[PDB]
Amino acid sequence: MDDIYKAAVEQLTEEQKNEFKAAFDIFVLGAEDGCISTKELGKVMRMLGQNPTPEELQEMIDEVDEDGSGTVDFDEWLVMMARCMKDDS
Ligand SMILES: [Ca+2]
């Protein structure tokens, strides 16, 4: 986990948290338990306009998955976006 990311995500707006919880549910719409595997995550990438390799997907998911279960949950997912905020020169 990362307190630096949760600190910024926690100070977010109600609309933000609601958005992540929504977009996340739309992605897991195919799953049965409610998660996103690198296998499917790669397919959705097409929507964004990018088509990264399959093995590369799990790469970014490795540093994200704190439990290393092999998939991204609503928890690791939400923080995933927040991490994009700290991405500055
Ligand atoms: Ca996980």
From Swiss-Prot:
**Keywords, ordered alphabetically:** Acetylation, Calcium, Cardiomyopathy, Disease variant, Metal-binding, Muscle protein, Phosphoprotein, Repeat
Q: Where, by residue number, does Ca(2+) 1 bind?
A: D65, D67, S69, T71, E76
Q: Which domain of life is it from?
A: Eukaryota
GO MF entries: actin filament binding; calcium ion binding; calcium-dependent protein binding; protein homodimerization activity; troponin I binding; troponin T binding
- The answer to whether keyword Kinase applies is no
Additional free-text comment from the UniProt record = Cardiac muscle Tn-C can bind 3 calcium ions per molecule. Domain I does not bind calcium.
Q: Where is the EF-hand domain?
A: 16-51, 52-87
Q: Which part of the entire sequence is included in the shown chain?
A: 1 to 89 of 161
Q: Does the keyword Zinc-finger apply?
A: no
Q: Name one GO cellular component term.
A: sarcomere
* Family membership noted in the UniProt record: Belongs to the troponin C family.
Q: What's this protein's function? A: Troponin is the central regulatory protein of striated muscle contraction. Tn consists of three components: Tn-I which is the inhibitor of actomyosin ATPase, Tn-T which contains the binding site for tropomyosin and Tn-C. The binding of calcium to Tn-C abolishes the inhibitory action of Tn on actin filaments.
Q: Which residues carry this modification: N-acetylmethionine?
A: M1
| Annotated protein name in UniProt | Troponin C, slow skeletal and cardiac muscles
Noted disease association is: Cardiomyopathy, dilated, 1Z: A disorder characterized by ventricular dilation and impaired systolic function, resulting in congestive heart failure and arrhythmia. Patients are at risk of premature death.
Q: Which GO terms describe its biological process?
A: cardiac muscle contraction; diaphragm contraction; muscle filament sliding; regulation of ATP-dependent activity; regulation of muscle contraction; regulation of muscle filament sliding speed; response to metal ion; skeletal muscle contraction
